Design an enzyme around this catalytic site. Structure first.
Site, PDB file in Angstrom:
ATOM      1  N   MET F  39      -1.098   4.547   7.618  1.00 51.99           N
ATOM      2  CA  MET F  39      -0.555   3.432   8.381  1.00 51.99           C
ATOM      3  C   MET F  39      -0.582   2.168   7.535  1.00 51.99           C
ATOM      4  O   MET F  39      -1.598   1.858   6.906  1.00 51.99           O
ATOM      5  CB  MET F  39      -1.348   3.218   9.671  1.00 51.99           C
ATOM      6  CG  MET F  39      -1.272   4.376  10.649  1.00 51.99           C
ATOM      7  SD  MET F  39      -2.286   4.125  12.117  1.00 51.99           S
ATOM      8  CE  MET F  39      -1.759   5.503  13.135  1.00 51.99           C
ATOM      9  N   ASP F  40       0.537   1.452   7.516  1.00 50.71           N
ATOM     10  CA  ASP F  40       0.637   0.174   6.830  1.00 50.71           C
ATOM     11  C   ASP F  40       0.301  -0.950   7.809  1.00 50.71           C
ATOM     12  O   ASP F  40      -0.260  -0.722   8.884  1.00 50.71           O
ATOM     13  CB  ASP F  40       2.020   0.007   6.205  1.00 50.71           C
ATOM     14  CG  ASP F  40       3.134   0.019   7.233  1.00 50.71           C
ATOM     15  OD1 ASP F  40       3.240  -0.947   8.016  1.00 50.71           O
ATOM     16  OD2 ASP F  40       3.915   0.992   7.247  1.00 50.71           O
ATOM     17  N   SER F  41       0.633  -2.185   7.430  1.00 46.25           N
ATOM     18  CA  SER F  41       0.292  -3.344   8.247  1.00 46.25           C
ATOM     19  C   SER F  41       0.836  -3.208   9.664  1.00 46.25           C
ATOM     20  O   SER F  41       0.074  -3.133  10.634  1.00 46.25           O
ATOM     21  CB  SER F  41       0.832  -4.613   7.589  1.00 46.25           C
ATOM     22  OG  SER F  41       0.382  -4.743   6.254  1.00 46.25           O
ATOM     23  N   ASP F  43       2.347  -0.771  11.250  1.00 41.40           N
ATOM     24  CA  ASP F  43       1.993   0.464  11.946  1.00 41.40           C
ATOM     25  C   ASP F  43       0.582   0.395  12.514  1.00 41.40           C
ATOM     26  O   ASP F  43       0.339   0.820  13.650  1.00 41.40           O
ATOM     27  CB  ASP F  43       2.117   1.659  11.001  1.00 41.40           C
ATOM     28  CG  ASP F  43       3.373   1.613  10.166  1.00 41.40           C
ATOM     29  OD1 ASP F  43       4.053   0.566  10.174  1.00 41.40           O
ATOM     30  OD2 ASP F  43       3.681   2.625   9.504  1.00 41.40           O
TER      31      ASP F  43
END
Ligand SMILES: CCCCCCCCCCCCCCCCCC(=O)OC[C@H](COP(=O)([O-])OCC(O)COP(=O)([O-])OC[C@@H](COC(=O)CCCCCCCCCCCCCCCCC)OC(=O)CCCCCCCCCCCCCCCCC)OC(=O)CCCCCCCCCCCCCCCCC
Ligand SMILES: CCCCCCCCCCCCCCCCCC(=O)OC[C@H](COP(=O)(O)OCCN)OC(=O)CCCCCCCCCCCCCCCCC
Ligand SMILES: CCCCCCCCCCCCCCCCCC(=O)OC[C@H](COP(=O)(O)OCCN)OC(=O)CCCCCCCCCCCCCCCCC
Ligand SMILES: CCCCCCCCCCCCCCCCCC(=O)OC[C@H](COP(=O)(O)OCCN)OC(=O)CCCCCCCCCCCCCCCCC
Ligand SMILES: CCCCCCCCCCCCCCCCCC(=O)OC[C@H](COP(=O)(O)OCCN)OC(=O)CCCCCCCCCCCCCCCCC
Ligand SMILES: CCCCCCCCCCCCCCCCCC(=O)OC[C@H](COP(=O)(O)OCCN)OC(=O)CCCCCCCCCCCCCCCCC
Ligand SMILES: CCCCCCCCCCCCCCCCCC(=O)OC[C@H](COP(=O)(O)OCCN)OC(=O)CCCCCCCCCCCCCCCCC
Ligand SMILES: CCCCCCCCCCCC(=O)OC[C@H](COP(=O)(O)OCC[N+](C)(C)C)OC(=O)CCCCCCCCCCC
Ligand SMILES: CCCCCCCCCCCC(=O)OC[C@H](COP(=O)(O)OCC[N+](C)(C)C)OC(=O)CCCCCCCCCCC
Ligand SMILES: CCCCCCCCCCCC(=O)OC[C@H](COP(=O)(O)OCC[N+](C)(C)C)OC(=O)CCCCCCCCCCC
Ligand SMILES: CCCCCCCCCCC[C@H](O)CC(=O)SCCNC(=O)CCNC(=O)[C@H](O)C(C)(C)COP(=O)(O)O
Lengths: 155, 192, 49, 78, 64, 93, 205, 506, 80
Positions: F39-41, F43
Site C-alpha cells: 500500500m502506498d500513501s 491506499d
C-alpha cells in the site's frame, strides 16, 4: 353518556405510546384539563380555577421552559388495546356497594344570613385560626428562593 | 416539683418585659456581649487562618452583637415567663400582679384591657400564643393581644391576703367591670 | 335534589392518578369493608333482641 | 370548562391522526355507555365477580345475611 | 476437617459469598429500579397478613 | 467502560482489511502495511481511516508518518478507546 | 415408663378438644396458586411491554433482567407456593395445630417440588440440601412462634396475673403446675418426681 | 432564636464579599446561634413540667418529655457537626477549602434544624405534611450544595425523586384518614382510633420508612451515601433518622392502643428483612462509606425492634440507643475526616481516582494507621468495637436494652435473628480493624515520606507543631472516652431514661 | 389490573417523565381531598387542599432546579 370517560380513555392510550418528552408534557396538560373541568362542574368551582392559575400558570409553562433546555432526540396495537380493555373492566375505586349506588340529599337552612364565598372562610381561618400553617409555608417559600439560587448559580 | 402560684398562664408581652427582675437584664446584658466574646474566644481556641491569634473583622463583631441581642432577650423573656406560669419563684411577682389587678378592678376597668378583637378572635389569639415560649428557642411568637383566656379565677383577687389590707381597695362585683365575659352579654347572647 | 357522592371520574380512571398505597387498599382489600359491614349488619340484629 | 371547548378539537384530531385506533377506543367507549343505558348487566356482573373472589362483602351476601337474620327472628317469636 | 468445616468457616464463606454476590447487583443508580420496589411493597398492605410466610418463601427463591 | 480487548480489535480488523486490495489474505499482528500489503500513501490512508470508522478512534498527525505495522494499530485502539457520553435519559432512569 | 428429656418449647394457645375447626386445604391452596400465578404472570407480560418502550437504553434492560422470571420459574413458584399451602394445612389437621415439625415437612417438600422445576440444571443432591435448608428456616420460624408470641408473651401473661409482680412466697405451695413464666420459691415434690423421675438421688439413691 | 437569627444570617450572608475567611467566620456564627438555642430551650423546657404534654399553637404542635429530649439531642449533635465546618479538620488548605467555599452551607443546616426539631412535635396532619417537607427539602438542597461536583448533584436528583415518592405516600395516607373521619388533629383522631382503618397509619409509616432507608427501600440510601462527599454524608445519614424514628415511635404509640396483630406482622416482616440485608450486605464491599451505610441500616433495624415492641422498656431502650449511636456515628465520621492526611502519594496500578470531596473512600486506605497515629486508631477501634457490641462499651447496653424490650413483648424470632445479624455483621467490622493494625509489625520498619501531611512546610523545626487541629482532636477524644468509660455513669444515666415519659403517668 | 403495576408502562423513559408522574400522583391526593372537603361541607379540608397545591408547587421548582443544574453539568465544559 358521560363524555368524561372517553377523554380519559384517550389519555390512557397516548400515555402508553408516549415516546419523547413532547408526549409526556402533553400528558400533564391532558391530565390537568379533565381535573379542572370535572371540578368546575360537580364538586368545587373555586379550586377548578385555583388549579389553572397555579398548575398551568406557574408549573406547566415552567415544565416546557426547562424541557427546551434538556434534549430533543429521535408490542403493537392489539396489545395496547387489550391492556386498556381489561384495565377498563373495573372502575369503582371504592367497594362499599351501598355507599355507591344509593343517592342522598341535604336540607338547606336559613340560619347563615351572612352568606360568604368559600374563599372568605378559608381566609378567615388560614389567616387567624391556622396562622402557623401560613407562616411556615412562607418560610418554606423562603427556603426555596435561597435554595433554587444555590443549586443553579455557578458562582 | 417546685410549683408556685399561677399568676398568668398566658402572660402578655408588655407584662413579661415589665416584670424583668434586675438579674434578667443582666442575663440580657451578658448575652448581648457574650456573642462577640464567644467569637473572640473561638479564635483563641483555634484561629480561622494561620496559626496565630487574629481578631475577627469589625463587621463580624457587629452582626454577632445583633445575634446576641436578639438571642439574649429570649433568655430574659423565658426567665420572666416561668415566673408567670408558676415554674419559678414568683413571690415578688405575685405581689405586683395582685396590686395591678386589684387596681384595675377598683377603677372599674378590666384586668386584661380593652381589645380590638371580637370575642372569637380573642379566643383564637389565646390558642396561638399560649405556651408558645416552649418553642421560643425554635421560632418566636408572643401574646400581644388583650384577650381573656388566662386560665384564672378572678375571685382569687377579691380575698385579701397578708400585707394587702393597707392598699384600701374597694372592688365591685364582676358583673360591672368593663370588658369582661360576665359583663358583656346583657342584650343578645350572641353578641358582646 | 337527590344525587350521588362518588369520586370524580378522573380520580378513578386515570392510568396513573388512581394508583396509591391507600387507593389499592380501598379497591382490592376487604379489610376495610369487613369491619364496616358489621356496623350495617348490627342495625338489623339489634331490633328484635 | 376548558375541556368542553377543547373536546371538539381533540376528537377530530384523534380520528385523523390514528383512524383505526380511534374507531376502537371511541367504539369501546360507546359500548359501556350503551351498556349502562340498556341495563345489560355486564359491568355489574364483572364487578360482582371481583367482589366474590377477593372476599369483599358482595350484594348477594348481604341479602343472604338479611335472610338469615330474618329467618332467625321470625322463629324467635314462635 | 469435614462436616464441621462445611458447617463452619469454610462452608459459611461460600454461602456469604453467594448471597453477597446477589446483593451487590441490587445497589445501582436507577430511578426505574427503585420505583418498582416501592410500588411492589404496596402489595404488603393489600395482601391478607396470613400470606407473609409465602412471600418469605418466594423471596428466598429469587435469591437463587 | 472500554469493552474492547486485543483479540476483539484483531478479529474485526481483518474484515476491514479483507475489504481492500491486499497482496496476501494472511494478516496478523506481525504483518506490515506498506510492505506486506503493498500500500502506498493514498491506499494506506483509506484503510487507516476505515479503522477509524469502525473502532471509533482518531489517529493524530504525530503517528501519521510513524505507522509501519498492523499490530500497532490494534494495540493503539485499546489505549485510545472510550464510550461516548450518554445523555441524562440513557444513563439514569 | 418413658424417658425424661428436657422440653424447650415456647408456650402456645392450646386449642382444647372440641375446638380447632379444620381449614379446607384444597380451597386455601387454590387461592395461593391462582393468586400467585396471576401476579407473576401479569408482571411478566407487563415487563415485556417495557422492553419495547425502550431497549437501546441499558438501564431499562439492566433492571428488567433482575425481575426477569424464567419460563419454568413461572410454574415453579405457583406450584411451590401452592404446594406449600396445601401441605401446610394438610399436616395441620392431623396435628390439631401448626407446629415446627409440620411446617418443616411442608417447607422442604414444597421447596423440592419447586426446586426440581427451575433448578433442573443442577445435581439433585444440591437441590435436596437447599430444600432441606429452606425447611429449617420455616421450622425455626414456627418454633419461635411466627413473628410474635401474642398472648403467650410475658407482657400479656404478666397483665393477666401469670407473672411475678407481687414477689414470691414459700408457704403457698401450688398443687397445680405453675405457668410458663411464673416463678416460685418452693415446689411440690411430686412435680419433681414427675419431671426428673425417681432414681439417681431423687427420693432414692 | 433560630428564626430570628437565620434571617439575619441570610441577609448578612450576601452583603459581605465571598471570601473563605468571611464564610468560615459566618459559619462560626451558625455555631453560636445553635448554642444559644440549646440554652434557651433548656432554660424553658424541663422534664418535670412536660410529663403531661403541653399543646402549642392551636393544638398544631404537642410537646412532652419524650419529644423534648430528642430536640435536645438533635441540637447537641448539630453543635458537634458544625465544629466540622466552623473549625479546621485537617489543616491543609487543599482538603479543607471544600468546607469554606459554599456560604449557604450553614444557612441550609439551620433550615434543616428548624425542620428537624419540629417534626417529632407534629399533632395535626396538616402540619405533618408541611413539616416533613421543610425537613425533606433541606436534605435535597444539602445534598446538592456542591454543584460543581458530578456525583453530589446526581445524589440529590436521586434523593429528590425517592423522597418525593415518600412524601406522596405520606400525603396519601393523611388524605385517606381525613376521608374516613373528616378530622385533622391527631388528638381528635385518637377518639376514633377504633373506627378508622388502622392500615392507613401503616401506609403513613411506609412513607416514613422510605425516608430513613429501611429494606426493601434500602437501595437508594446506600447509593446516595456512597456518592455524596464525606462532609455531607455525615449529616444526611444520621439527622433524618433522629427526627423520624421519634415520629415513628409516637405513631406506633397511638397504634398500639388497638394492638392490631396484623400490623405487627407486616412491620416485623420489614424488620426481619432489614437485618438480613444490613448484615449480609456489607460482607462484600470495598468502600468505607458503603460499609457505614450498611451499618446504619442494621442499627436502624435494631432500633425499630424496640419501637415495634413499644412498652415501658422500649422508651428506656430507644432513648439510650438513639443517643449512643449518634455520638458513635459522629465519632467515626470525625475520625475518617481527619485520617485523610496520611494517604500515600504516587511517584500506575488500577488507575484509582480519588477526588477532593471524598479523600477516604476505600477501606484499604486505612492501612498502617496503628503506625501513623496509634492514639487515633485506638479511638477508631473503640468506636468500631462499640458497634460490634463489645461490653462494657456504649454499644453493648444498646443491644442489651433492645433485647429486653424485644423479648418482653414476645419478639422471640426477631430477637434471635437480631443476634445472628449481630454476629454476621461482626465480620465486616473486624475487616476495618484488620486493615488498621494486622500488618503493624511487618511494616514497623518502613521508609515513607510520601504522606499527604508531609507536604506542609517545616515552620521552625524546634517548636512542637501538632499534626491535627485543636478542636477536632478534642471532640474525638471526648467522644472516645464516653464510649469506653460509660460503665461508671450507666446506672445514673439509665435512671435518667426512667424519667422520660410518653403518656405513662401511672 | 393495577396489582400488575401497569402504571409503570405509562411512564416515560426520561428523568423529566418521572417528575411528571409524581405531580400527577400528588394531584390525585388533592382531588380526593376536595372530594372529601366538599361533601362534608368542611372548609378545613379545603385549607389542606390549598396547602397541598402550594407545597407541591415548591417541590416542582426544587426538582427542576436540580435537574437543570444536573443537565448543565454534562455540558459544563465551557472552553470558549
Ligand atoms: C417557621 C415560621 C415562623 C414564623 C414566625 C413569624 C414571626 C412570629 C413572631 C411575631 C408574633 C406574631 C403574632 C402577631 C399576631 C398578633 C396580632 C394582634 O394581636 O393584633 C392585636 C393587636 C392590638 O390589639 P390589642 O389587644 O388591643 O393590643 C393592644 C396593644 O398593642 C397591646 O396591649 P398591651 O397592654 O400589651 O400594651 C399596650 C402598650 C403598652 O402597655 C403597657 O403595659 C406598657 C408596658 C411598659 C413597656 C416598657 C417599655 C417598652 C419599650 C418602650 O403598648 C405596647 O407596648 C404594645 C405592645 C407591643 C410592643 C412591641 C411588640 C414587639 C414584639 C416583638 O395588634 C397590635 O397592635 C400588636 C402590636 C405589635 C405588632 C406585631 C408584633 C409582632 C410582629
Ligand atoms: C385543543 C385540542 C388540540 C388537540 C391537539 C392534539 C390532538 C391529539 C390528541 C391528543 C390529546 C389526547 C390526550 C393525550 C395528550 C397528548 C399526548 C400525545 O401523545 O399526543 C399525540 C399527538 C398526536 O400525534 P400522534 O401521531 O397521534 O402520536 C405519535 C406522535 N409521534 O402529538 C402530540 O404530541 C401533540 C402535539 C401538540 C401538543 C399540544 C399540547 C397538547 C394538547 C393540549 C390541549 C389538549 C387538552 C387535552 C384534550 C384531550 C383530553 C383527553
Ligand atoms: C375481573 C376481575 C378483575 C380483578 C382485578 C385484579 C385481578 C387479580 C390480580 C391478581 C390478584 C392477586 C391479589 C388478590 C387480591 C389481594 C389479596 C387479597 O386481598 O385477598 C384475596 C385472596 C383471598 O382472600 P380471602 O381468603 O378470600 O379473604 C377473605 C377474608 N374474609 O388472597 C389470595 O389468597 C391471593 C393469593 C396471594 C398469595 C400469593 C401471591 C403472593 C406472593 C407473590 C407476591 C408478588 C411479589 C410481592 C412481594 C411483596 C414486596 C415486598
Ligand atoms: C419477580 C418477583 C419480584 C418480587 C420482588 C419482591 C420485592 C421485595 C423483595 C425483598 C428484598 C428486596 C430486594 C430488592 C428487590 C429484589 C430485586 C430482585 O428481585 O431481582 C432478583 C435479584 C437478582 O437476581 P440475579 O440472579 O442476579 O439475576 C437473574 C437474571 N436472570 O436477586 C436478588 O438478589 C433478590 C433477593 C434479595 C435478597 C432478599 C432476601 C430477604 C430476606 C430473605 C430471607 C429472610 C431472612 C431471615 C430468614 C430466617 C428468618 C425467617
Ligand atoms: C442445616 C442446613 C442443611 C444444609 C445442607 C448442606 C449440605 C451440602 O453439602 O450441600 C451440598 C452443597 C455443598 O457443595 P460441595 O461440598 O462442594 O459438594 C459438591 C459435590 N459435588 O451445597 C450446595 O451447593 C447447595 C446446598 C446449600 C444449602 C444452603 C441453604 C441452607 C439454608 C438454611 C441453612 C440453615
Ligand atoms: C454539648 C454537651 C452539652 C450537654 C447538655 C445536655 C443537657 O443539658 O440536656 C439534658 C437532657 C435532659 O435534661 P432536661 O430534663 O431536659 O433539662 C435539664 C437540663 N439539665 O438530656 C439530654 O437529652 C441530652 C441528650 C444528649 C446527651 C449528649 C451528652 C454530651 C455529649 C458529649 C459532649 C462532648 C463534648 C465536646 C466538647 C467540645 C469542645 C471543643
Ligand atoms: C455446628 C454449629 C455450626 C453453626 C452454623 C451451622 C449452620 C451453617 C450453615 C452452612 C450450610 C450452608 C453453607 C455451605 C453450603 C454451600 C452454599 C453455597 O456455596 O451456595 C450453594 C448454592 C449455589 O451453588 P454455588 O454458588 O455453585 O456454590 C458451590 C459451593 N460448593 O447457593 C445456595 O444454595 C444459597 C442458598 C440461598 C441462600 C438462602 C439464605 C437464607 C438464610 C440462610 C441463613 C442466613 C441467616 C438468616 C438469619 C440471619 C439474617 C436475618
Ligand atoms: C475558666 C472555665 C472555662 C474553661 C474553658 C472552656 C473553653 C476553653 C477555652 C480556653 C482557651 C483555649 O482554648 O486556649 C487554647 C488552648 C491551647 O491550644 P493548643 O491545643 O495548645 O493549641 C496551641 C496553642 N498555643 C499556640 C498557645 C500553644 O486550648 C485549650 O485549652 C483546649 C481545651 C479544650 C476545651 C476544654 C473545654 C471542654 C468543655 C466540655 C463541656 C462539654
Ligand atoms: C449455634 C452455634 C454457634 C457456634 C458459633 C457460630 C458458627 C461459627 C462461624 C464462624 C465463621 C468464621 O469465623 O468466619 C470465618 C469465615 C471464613 O474464614 P476466612 O478467614 O475467610 O478463611 C477462609 C478463607 N478462604 C475461604 C478464602 C479459603 O468467614 C465467613 O464465612 C464470614 C461470614 C461468617 C458468618 C457467621 C454467621 C454466624 C451464625 C451463627 C448462628 C448459626
Ligand atoms: C433450642 C434448640 C432445640 C429446640 C427444640 C427443637 O428444635 O425441637 C424440634 C423442633 C420442634 O418440634 P415440634 O413440632 O415443636 O415438636 C413436637 C411438638 N410438641 C413437642 C409441642 C408436642 O423441630 C424443628 O424443626 C425445630 C427447628 C430448629 C430450630 C432451632 C433453633 C434454636 C436456636 C437457639 C435457641 C436458644
Ligand atoms: C464533498 C466534496 C469533496 C470535494 C473534494 C475536493 C478535493 C480537492 C482536491 C485537492 C487538489 C489539490 O489542489 C492538490 C493536492 O491535493 S496536493 C498534492 C500535490 N502533490 C505535490 O505537489 C507533490 C507531493 N506529492 C505527494 O506527496 C504524493 O503525490 C501524494 C500526495 C500522493 C502522497 O501520497 P504517497 O506518496 O503515495
Amino acid at each position: 353518556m358521560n363524555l368524561e370517560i372517553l377523554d380519559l380513555s384517550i389519555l390512557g392510550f397516548y400515555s402508553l405510546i408516549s415516546s419523547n418528552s413532547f408526549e409526556s408534557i402533553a400528558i400533564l396538560v391532558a391530565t390537568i384539563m379533565p381535573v379542572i373541568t370535572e371540578l368546575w362542574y360537580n364538586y368545587s368551582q373555586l379550586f377548578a380555577l385555583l388549579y389553572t392559575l397555579i398548575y398551568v400558570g406557574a408549573v406547566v409553562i415552567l415544565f416546557v421552559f426547562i424541557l427546551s433546555v434538556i434534549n430533543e432526540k429521535e408490542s403493537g396495537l392489539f396489545i395496547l388495546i387489550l391492556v386498556l380493555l381489561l384495565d377498563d373492566l373495573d372502575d369503582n375505586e371504592s367497594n362499599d356497594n351501598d355507599y355507591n349506588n344509593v343517592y342522598i340529599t341535604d336540607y338547606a337552612d336559613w340560619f347563615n344570613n351572612y352568606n360568604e364565598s368559600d374563599l372568605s372562610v378559608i381566609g378567615n381561618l388560614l389567616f387567624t385560626e391556622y396562622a402557623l400553617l401560613l407562616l411556615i409555608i412562607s418560610f418554606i417559600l423562603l427556603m426555596s428562593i435561597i435554595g433554587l439560587i444555590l443549586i443553579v448559580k455557578k458562582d | 416539683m417546685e410549683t408556685y402560684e399561677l399568676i398568668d398562664s398566658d402572660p402578655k408581652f408588655s407584662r413579661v418585659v415589665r416584670y424583668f427582675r434586675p438579674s434578667d437584664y443582666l442575663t440580657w446584658a451578658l448575652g448581648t456581649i457574650g456573642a462577640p466574646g464567644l467569637m473572640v474566644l473561638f479564635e483563641k481556641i483555634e484561629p480561622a487562618k494561620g496559626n496565630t491569634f487574629k481578631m475577627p473583622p469589625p463587621s463580624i463583631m457587629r452582626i454577632a452583637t445583633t445575634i446576641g441581642f436578639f438571642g439574649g432577650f429570649y433568655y430574659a423573656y423565658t426567665s420572666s415567663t416561668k415566673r408567670f406560669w408558676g415554674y419559678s419563684e414568683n413571690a415578688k411577682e405575685v405581689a405586683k400582679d395582685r396590686y395591678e389587678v386589684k387596681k384595675a378592678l377598683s377603677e372599674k376597668k378590666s384586668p386584661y384591657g380593652s381589645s380590638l378583637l371580637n370575642p372569637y378572635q380573642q379566643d383564637m389569639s389565646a390558642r396561638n400564643s399560649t405556651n408558645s415560649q416552649l418553642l421560643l428557642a425554635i421560632f418566636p411568637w408572643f401574646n400581644v393581644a388583650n384577650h381573656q383566656s388566662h386560665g384564672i379565677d378572678l375571685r382569687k383577687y377579691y380575698e385579701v391576703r397578708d400585707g394587702e389590707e393597707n392598699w384600701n381597695f374597694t372592688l365591685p362585683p364582676l358583673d360591672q367591670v368593663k370588658d369582661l365575659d360576665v359583663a358583656q352579654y346583657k342584650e343578645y347572647s350572641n353578641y358582646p | 335534589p337527590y344525587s350521588n357522592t362518588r369520586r370524580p371520574w378522573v380520580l378513578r380512571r386515570h392510568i396513573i392518578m388512581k394508583n396509591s398505597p391507600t387507593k389499592w387498599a380501598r379497591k382490592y382489600s376487604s379489610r376495610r369493608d369487613e369491619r364496616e359491614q358489621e356496623i350495617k349488619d348490627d342495625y338489623i340484629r339489634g331490633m328484635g333482641e | 370548562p376548558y375541556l368542553v371547548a377543547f373536546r371538539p378539537a381533540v376528537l377530530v384530531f384523534f380520528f385523523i391522526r390514528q383512524p383505526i385506533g380511534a374507531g376502537l377506543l371511541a367504539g369501546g367507549f360507546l359500548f359501556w355507555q350503551a351498556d349502562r343505558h340498556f341495563n345489560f348487566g355486564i359491568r355489574d356482573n364483572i364487578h360482582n365477580f371481583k367482589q366474590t373472589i377477593l372476599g369483599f362483602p358482595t350484594q348477594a351476601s348481604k341479602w343472604e345475611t338479611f335472610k338469615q337474620v330474618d329467618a332467625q327472628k321470625r322463629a324467635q317469636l314462635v | 476437617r469435614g462436616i464441621l468445616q462445611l458447617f463452619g468457616p469454610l462452608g459459611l464463606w461460600k454461602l456469604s459469598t453467594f448471597i453477597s454476590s446477589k446483593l451487590n447487583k441490587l445497589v445501582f443508580l436507577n430511578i426505574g429500579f427503585i420505583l418498582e420496589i416501592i410500588v411492589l411493597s404496596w402489595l404488603l398492605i393489600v395482601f391478607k397478613v396470613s400470606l407473609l410466610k409465602y412471600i418469605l418463601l418466594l423471596i428466598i427463591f429469587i435469591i437463587l | 467502560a472500554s469493552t474492547l480487548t486485543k483479540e476483539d480489535v484483531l478479529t474485526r480488523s481483518v474484515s476491514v482489511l479483507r475489504g481492500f486490495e491486499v497482496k496476501t489474505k494472511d494478516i496478523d499482528l506481525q504483518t506490515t502495511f506498506v510492505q506486506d500489503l503493498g500500500m502506498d500513501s493514498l491506499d494506506l490512508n483509506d484503510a487507516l481511516v476505515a479503522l477509524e470508522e469502525e473502532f471509533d478512534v482518531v489517529f493524530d498527525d504525530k503517528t501519521a508518518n510513524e505507522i509501519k505495522t498492523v499490530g500497532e494499530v490494534v494495540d493503539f485502539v485499546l489505549a485510545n478507546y472510550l464510550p461516548t457520553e450518554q445523555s441524562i435519559n440513557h444513563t439514569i432512569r | 415408663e418413658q424417658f425424661h428429656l428436657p422440653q424447650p418449647f415456647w408456650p402456645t394457645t392450646k386449642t382444647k378438644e372440641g375446638e380447632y375447626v379444620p381449614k379446607d386445604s384444597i380451597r386455601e391452596a387454590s387461592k395461593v396458586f391462582i393468586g400467585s400465578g396471576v401476579l407473576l404472570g401479569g408482571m411478566h407480560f407487563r415487563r415485556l411491554m417495557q422492553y419495547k418502550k425502550g431497549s437501546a437504553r441499558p438501564g431499562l434492560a439492566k433492571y428488567l433482567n433482575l425481575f426477569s422470571l424464567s419460563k419454568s420459574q413461572l410454574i415453579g413458584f405457583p406450584v411451590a407456593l401452592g404446594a406449600f399451602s396445601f401441605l401446610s394445612h394438610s399436616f395441620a389437621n392431623l396435628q390439631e395445630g401448626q407446629t415446627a415439625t409440620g411446617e418443616f415437612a411442608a417447607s422442604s417438600i414444597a421447596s423440592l417440588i419447586g426446586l426440581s422445576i427451575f433448578r433442573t440444571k443442577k445435581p439433585l443432591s444440591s437441590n435436596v440440601a437447599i430444600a432441606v435448608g429452606m425447611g429449617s428456616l420455616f421450622g425455626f420460624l414456627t418454633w419461635a412462634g411466627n413473628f410474635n408470641l401474642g398472648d403467650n408473651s410475658y407482657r400479656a401473661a404478666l397483665e393477666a396475673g401469670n407473672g411475678n409482680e407481687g414477689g414470691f412466697d414459700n408457704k403457698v405451695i401450688k398443687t397445680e403446675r405453675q405457668g410458663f413464666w411464673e416463678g416460685v420459691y418452693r415446689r411440690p415434690l411430686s412435680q419433681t418426681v414427675e419431671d426428673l423421675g425417681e432414681g439417681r438421688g431423687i427420693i432414692t439413691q | 432564636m433560630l428564626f430570628t437569627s437565620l434571617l439575619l444570617i441570610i441577609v448578612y450572608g450576601s452583603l459581605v464579599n465571598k471570601s473563605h475567611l468571611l464564610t468560615k467566620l459566618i459559619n462560626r456564627l451558625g455555631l453560636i446561634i445553635i448554642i444559644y438555642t440549646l440554652l434557651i430551650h433548656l432554660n424553658i423546657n424541663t422534664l418535670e413540667n412536660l410529663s403531661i404534654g403541653i399543646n402549642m399553637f392551636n393544638n398544631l404542635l404537642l410537646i412532652n418529655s419524650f419529644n423534648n429530649t430528642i430536640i435536645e439531642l438533635i441540637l447537641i449533635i448539630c453543635i458537634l457537626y458544625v465544629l466540622l465546618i466552623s473549625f479546621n479538620i485537617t489543616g491543609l488548605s487543599i482538603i479543607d477549602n471544600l468546607n469554606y467555599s459554599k456560604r449557604t452551607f450553614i444557612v441550609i443546616v439551620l433550615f434543616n434544624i428548624i425542620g428537624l426539631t419540629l417534626l417529632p412535635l407534629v399533632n395535626d396532619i396538616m402540619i405533618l405534611f408541611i413539616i416533613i417537607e421543610l425537613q425533606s427539602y433541606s436534605l435535597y438542597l444539602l445534598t446538592a450544595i456542591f454543584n460543581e461536583s458530578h456525583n453530589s448533584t446526581k445524589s440529590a436528583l436521586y434523593y429528590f425523586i425517592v423522597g418525593s415518592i415518600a412524601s406522596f405516600i405520606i400525603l396519601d395516607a393523611t388524605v385517606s384518614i381525613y376521608d374516613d373521619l373528616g378530622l385533622t388533629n391527631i388528638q381528635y383522631i385518637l377518639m376514633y382510633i377504633d373506627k378508622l382503618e388502622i392500615f392507613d397509619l401503616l401506609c403513613l409509616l411506609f412513607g416514613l420508612f422510605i425516608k430513613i432507608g429501611l429494606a426493601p427501600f434500602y437501595s437508594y440510601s446506600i447509593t446516595i451515601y456512597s456518592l455524596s462527599p464525606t462532609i455531607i454524608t455525615n449529616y444526611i445519614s444520621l439527622m433524618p433518622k433522629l427526627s423520624i424514628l421519634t415520629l415513628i415511635y409516637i405513631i406506633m404509640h397511638y397504634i398500639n392502643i388497638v394492638n392490631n396483630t396484623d400490623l405487627n406482622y407486616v412491620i416485623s416482616f420489614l424488620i426481619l428483612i432489614s437485618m438480613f440485608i444490613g448484615s449480609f450486605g456489607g460482607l462484600n464491599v470495598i468502600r468505607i462509606k458503603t460499609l457505614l451505610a450498611y451499618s446504619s441500616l442494621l442499627n436502624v433495624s435494631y432500633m425499630l425492634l424496640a419501637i415495634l415492641s413499644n412498652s415501658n422498656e422500649s422508651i428506656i431502650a430507644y432513648i439510650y440507643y438513639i443517643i449512643q449511636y449518634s455520638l458513635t456515628h459522629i465519632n467515626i465520621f470525625s475520625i475518617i475526616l481527619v485520617i485523610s492526611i496520611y494517604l500515600p502519594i504516587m511517584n500506575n496500578m488500577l488507575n484509582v481516582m480519588i477526588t477532593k470531596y471524598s479523600p477516604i473512600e476505600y477501606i484499604n486506605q486505612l492501612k498502617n494507621l496503628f503506625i501513623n497515629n496509634i492514639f487515633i486508631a485506638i479511638a477508631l477501634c473503640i468506636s468500631i468495637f462499640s458497634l460490634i457490641g463489645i461490653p462494657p462499651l456504649t454499644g453493648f447496653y444498646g443491644k442489651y436494652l433492645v433485647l429486653i424490650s424485644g423479648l418482653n413483648n414476645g419478639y422471640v424470632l426477631l430477637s434471635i435473628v437480631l443476634i445472628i445479624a449481630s454476629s454476621i455483621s461482626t465480620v465486616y467490622y473486624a475487616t476495618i480493624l484488620k486493615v488498621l493494625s494486622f500488618d503493624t509489625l511487618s511494616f514497623k520498619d518502613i521508609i515513607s515520606n510520601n504522606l499527604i501531611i508531609n507536604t506542609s512546610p517545616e515552620n521552625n523545626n524546634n517548636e512542637i507543631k501538632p499534626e491535627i487541629s485543636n478542636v477536632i482532636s478534642y471532640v474525638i477524644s471526648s467522644l472516645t472516652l464516653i464510649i469506653l468509660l460509660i460503665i461508671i455513669q450507666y446506672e445514673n444515666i439509665v435512671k435518667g431514661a426512667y424519667l422520660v415519659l410518653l403518656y405513662n403517668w401511672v | 389490573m393495577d396489582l400488575i403495576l401497569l402504571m409503570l408502562v405509562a411512564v416515560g423513559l426520561n428523568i423529566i417523565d418521572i417528575y411528571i408522574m409524581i405531580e400527577i400522583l400528588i394531584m390525585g391526593c388533592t382531588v380526593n381531598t376536595i372530594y372529601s372537603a366538599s361533601l362534608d361541607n368542611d372548609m378545613i379540608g379545603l385549607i389542606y387542599s390549598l396547602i397541598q397545591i402550594i407545597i407541591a408547587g415548591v417541590e416542582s421548582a426544587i426538582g427542576l432546579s436540580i435537574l437543570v443544574n444536573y443537565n448543565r453539568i454534562r455540558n459544563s465544559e465551557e472552553i470558549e
